[PDB]
Design a protein around this ligand. Structure first.
Ligand SMILES: [Cl-]
Ligand SMILES: [Cl-]
Ligand SMILES: [Cl-]
Ligand SMILES: [Cl-]
Ligand SMILES: [Fe+3]
Ligand SMILES: [Fe+3]
Ligand SMILES: [Fe+3]
Ligand SMILES: [Fe+3]
Ligand SMILES: [Fe+3]
Ligand SMILES: [Fe+3]
Ligand SMILES: [Fe+3]
Ligand SMILES: [Fe+3]
Ligand SMILES: [Fe+3]
Ligand SMILES: [Fe+3]
Ligand SMILES: [Fe+3]
Ligand SMILES: [Fe+3]
Ligand SMILES: [Mg+2]
Ligand SMILES: [Mg+2]
Ligand SMILES: [Mg+2]
Ligand SMILES: [Mg+2]
Lengths: 161, 160, 161, 159, 159, 161, 161, 161, 160, 160, 159, 161
């Protein structure tokens, strides 16, 4: 027992309300992106339907894994996620996805914008998150990178060169 | 030969009532998915791990269900709406709480919301069946999968 | 507005004692089929031993998954399954599998007949089950179909020109 | 003491029922064959997606024909999936020879899927009246085929 | 030039040996059946864990009964796994009807596992005397069953 | 220095109408073999039903992969395959599979003969294919070999002492 | 305190020349069984060809894994296996597999007898092996059991009523 | 060779003794956590045994992967890990795990504390590690995050709300 | 017995011409792999995703091909050279552009380079076959795999 | 019927000697696992990679072995002690060095420690077998697996 | 109307062809057996790599012998893979008894591989003249064996 | 729409030319390492050939995954990778790999040096990359770590202690 600590209830790292609130911002935009991604996935029609249909599902998978990661990171640090529909709708920073069928070209533009807005949210909270907890900032880096890849893979469809 | 001669043979498309009925199922499946994840993250207390894990299985089922329903709508020329605003505005499920809840409370809350979702499907079933027997089979899969989840979750709180 | 329902104790579907009794009839014949299937699997000898030995295991697998499905369907709707040995022996409608070794030819006829009997039971309860709960009838259809396929794959050994 | 005593008689179907499944079988096989034809010969804008989706259509149609033929055998009917029979009795419009543009293939194949679904819907009630289990297999065929129709046709859809 | 010359005679076992394996077989089958009964009907605190563990018990017991019946056949004995025989000759206390609490299921099932192990231990030496290889299969059964007993009983254990 | 070629429209290998016609002959017999294989698979009854039923599916699988390979080889070299039902029926060299159920023994002889016929076709076109394009002849060798193996595995049921 | 042993060259278990000679007897009969199993697998014709052809490969697989196990057990205890063709032919106790094709019925009897002989060898060395090294006897039990199961699965083709 | 370096023995990045020593601290606490996790895994008894039994194994897997990663990171940077039992016991900062069977409730509390102490160690060395080698700090982030998740998944059992 | 008596039985080794011919195939396969990845990253426009993905399949094929050829050389006592300098200096493929290119342009460019690679193999085939029929079979696999890729890529740009 | 009538049928439990004997096996398996990893990380020199990899296979075997033994103890109502302090205090294996060691040295060191571990098991085997034949079978698996590892490792250093 | 009419005659091979495949078969089997012998008995520097590579050699040789024997059967020839025949008719130099050093095993096995390839190359043209498809199987054998020779021999190679 | 942004073409993060140029440096050295790794993999001969042969392939896999990641990161941020052979050769910082067969000992030394030079390149651009885009620096950390592990696993062969 020469180097053993004797404490009996050694506590874990707890997030400040500011940190919790910052992760909460990331969470709602990821959930909203997931819902908008499926909406697009179902309702996309026209030239190169299948590619975008499939790519959109891949986007949804990434955003769903991301939201779960963020929420669980909140839980680990004693924060309480709110991913309920009312909260997501009232607090998301993403512009609303339109109703009805939309062309591949329009879906490409719309979805790219909503991905970009989601990355924006993460980049906006990044420094405050990093300052409090360097480990959580790494999760943010993974999210930024995966989302920016999705953005590139989707937007390239509409590129005119 | 017995070969048909038409060049643009049309598919079966759904009445607006039919689309409407599938839309009802769609929003409650999505809401159940979002509430399931909320419960999955925020459940605490006795037998946490079992419920944490089972709630994830409920979410998996509800998500594939919602995707199935929306794609059923699309095949039949209907247009699903799974957006957050629409879901919050039109879901029939009682709202899930925002905060930590005990395993016992989560079991009771989630069972109710599963039952509410099954009820939506049971309420539209006959009108769906009358228009398209094939789509009713999809509804049967949802009822049974969800009723199974309800049993697997609720049994935690069952007395002797 | 809000379409959200108010009740905190929203009830699940309520199943009649007749419904439970009907699935119970299906349950015991599937369990009995599985037990007889293994008996045949172990005790078959003669021309084309290996094929029947193998097919009999596939039948057992289907029948085991079936009985579990039925029993869980009972539980979901607050019925209480009884798959105990005494009850299966006392209430199965299948003729008993004979003791000791049986020829491939005889095993073919016997097991085909036991599948016929098992399907007969499902057909006997079908209409009453479908009227009360169409979703459960769908599971019955899955059972009927898988079993009829097993009967075809087994019985065709004995069919001539 | 609940054990029945007799062979307890096996499975059988009316010749009308068998003929109804036979109608479904030939169109599934024709669809599979036309599907591969389209798969090989499609050219042009968004070739790859259609080439791939058409193979998924063929897979579904092949599994379907198996399911129907096996259902026929289970109930002691006897399927006919031979080339001569399929060509003589299929209700599907003939697939054209030669290469076809992606846009043309989309319209052609959507029609042939729809014709296949039509056949299933045509026999459905007569099949259901004799065997509700068989009807469920028809429901699975309708659903999978109508999904393929949606996934294929969406390429040409203007909004 | 070491090659033997005669059919060199096949495998066989005494009727006493076959009867000893038959005792093990019926209790494994009974255990499997009671296991599923428990699996379906357990309710209450920590339902899910027990529901899942009981299925793992059933898997082990089913594979075991196969192993024993196949061992019997390999040595030209003839197993009896029929419902009537299992019910008439099993040594396991009957599993009760109806739903049972997790705590009650834990105690009930632990006892039935222990009774199954008892049967294996009872015939072990007689089996070993005739065939040491068969005894090894019995050792595998004892070990897997005693592990299941530990994994199940631990739920009720107070320290 | 630079060994790099200058042309921007470097042409692929150019195949004669005779080459396409030769693979077309192979294509229709493989498709016909696959259709007859399924017919036999469904309609075989009698002693050793299960083994033949299973082996026939393996044959169908090989023949289906084969026909796809041949058709794609045609496309690669700008030939246009025709695998449509009418053409297969009108141009296959295989004797037609008889209607209705057939005994295991009869199915063995029939299907073995249809494999023999299919291999015969490949052998008939082989030399002309090999002279124009050795790479394609290699694929023919793969086909011949897999089919001969299928003939062995099926026909040996009927071979005596 | 310290229960740690002092020696730097702690010896492994030392096996008698008799032990090695005993496993060598097992080794050659397993290799011979594997070679005869393949011979039968290739050369069997007649009623139920496919089942026996398949089962014979499973036997070969078991016998090959067995011989490798035995040889490695020899190496672990500083015995030196000899699995060379000349030694196997000169020292195997199995009757030789006859040349040319054999009927399914004959192959059944022959191979069953060769399994019987292989198990006989293991039984002959068993007691001496168990007395010197119980761990090795356990591996012998695994071999005996797998082989007896193979004999059952093969021989039952020829058993009547 | 226009941009090619001409050096023949280009050396890799070498850890300072301070860096090596910091990784060594992480290593022993991860190994100790792994040993204590198994001790708990075997000896946990009572309400919700199975869940904790399984979750504890998942903790052990993570800590074992972690220790291997840390040790290999030391090796790559020319440091020499010491993961021997004597060293771990003499130098771990974790309080000793008690002997004997312990209740689920007590195991939950004990293990949470030891996870927290392990995270503490990593957080204590984090900044010094980051300053010398940003890449290694990322490995630390992965460890912190995985361990804090485990803490949450374990401790939630005892949460009273 | 029929057992041979030699202790150091030699393997078949290739002439310098044979090694040379395989070296030619090797550099064009490597160059095709590098150009395929360039195109994979930099393709933009209509039907991007399909081409992005197909180009990766081309790269996978060309890489396993180059590895096969080099290992064929090694087995026959020849020494492959797959280094960047050698590849740039000796490849027969027209250079791929540095920048973003449209899907239509990438289809045309890549088809040409695949065809150039097949041409190299077809040009060495007969001399390879004459020395070692077994190695020609490897060449056949490369020709057919690459010609398949050419078809799958080029079809995007095909008129009615 | 032949059904037994008791409600709380007891399982076989081990004597303290039996538990003690399994405890002896447990600590040497754990110590071997820790020493195996030490050797795995710190081995350097000729044929490093083979030994690095083989030592990991030894560790995998020893870990599943220790888990098996501890769970055997638990089933029989004995209480394992696998804690670091207990392992260091009671293991019979000679201590592994702290620093880099050559492949040749690591082969010799690890072979000795494997042999020491097998010896512990062989020393308790007969008393274990006498009380519980089923547990002796587990011991046989450990002896053979470890003796296999000893052969696979030691062979590196074997003369002509 | 292109359908042929007769059984259309089955596959067959000349006895010379069958004998040529028989030569390949025995050396593949001998190689497999010597391969395992080497695999078990190799000791010394870089033991593990050689132990593992030799097993990969055995796998290839076993699959090869299967391919050849099955080819023989497909064309209605009758293989002989029995121990007595292999030992009496193999062209491979005998593998020595006892443990051998890694360096010696490398040289020994490389020679036996080369001898096996020699046999395949020896019969190749005669086989090809009757059946070009069979020759392709021989090409696959040559290629896989020559790769194994390279992977094994490289251990002893000095540059 | 209470928190929803109203922007319609929200743009993504764009790399500066400096950032693009820095990733371009990493890219060419990874590609060059991949080509040199294969060259070594084919041409290594002598003592412990097989180990190095296999380890070199593992190095190539890692460097190939790395180059693809770097290039795709450039694409996501609107930079245009150049991985063409001419560019790689003209701009790589790695010393040339020699022609011809080389001993295991020489290959170990040569390859270790080229790995070290590749890590050097990444470490040289690290800070400038981190300053502009923290998320991309994490990808660099993964590359450094994986490469330094490979270096250790390769170089240890030649270590004399
Ligand atoms: Cl795709
Ligand atoms: Cl089979
Ligand atoms: Cl669980
Ligand atoms: Cl290796
Ligand atoms: Fe989660
Ligand atoms: Fe979808
Ligand atoms: Fe269940
Ligand atoms: Fe079928
Ligand atoms: Fe069994
Ligand atoms: Fe295709
Ligand atoms: Fe081995
Ligand atoms: Fe490691
Ligand atoms: Fe390679
Ligand atoms: Fe465990
Ligand atoms: Fe074979
Ligand atoms: Fe990529
Ligand atoms: Mg639990
Ligand atoms: Mg058979
Ligand atoms: Mg596309
Ligand atoms: Mg090595």
């Amino acid at each position: 027992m020469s180097a053993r600590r004797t404490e009996s209830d050694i506590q874990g790292f707890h997030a400040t309300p500011e940190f919790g609130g910052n992760l909460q911002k990331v969470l709602v935009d990821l959930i909203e992106l997931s819902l908008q991604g499926k909406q697009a996935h179902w309702n996309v029609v026209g030239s190169n339907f299948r590619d975008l249909h499939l790519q959109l599902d891949e986007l949804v998978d990434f955003a769903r894994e991301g939201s779960d990661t963020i929420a669980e990171e909140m839980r680990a640090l004693d924060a309480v996620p709110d991913g309920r529909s009312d909260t997501v709708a009232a607090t998301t920073t993403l512009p609303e996805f339109p109703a009805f069928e939309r062309s591949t070209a329009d879906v490409v533009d719309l979805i790219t914008t909503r991905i970009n807005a989601t990355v924006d949210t993460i980049r906006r909270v990044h420094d405050a998150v990093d300052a409090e907890d360097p480990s959580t900032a790494d999760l943010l880096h993974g999210l930024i990178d995966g989302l920016e890849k999705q953005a590139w893979l989707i937007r390239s469809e509409n590129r005119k060169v």
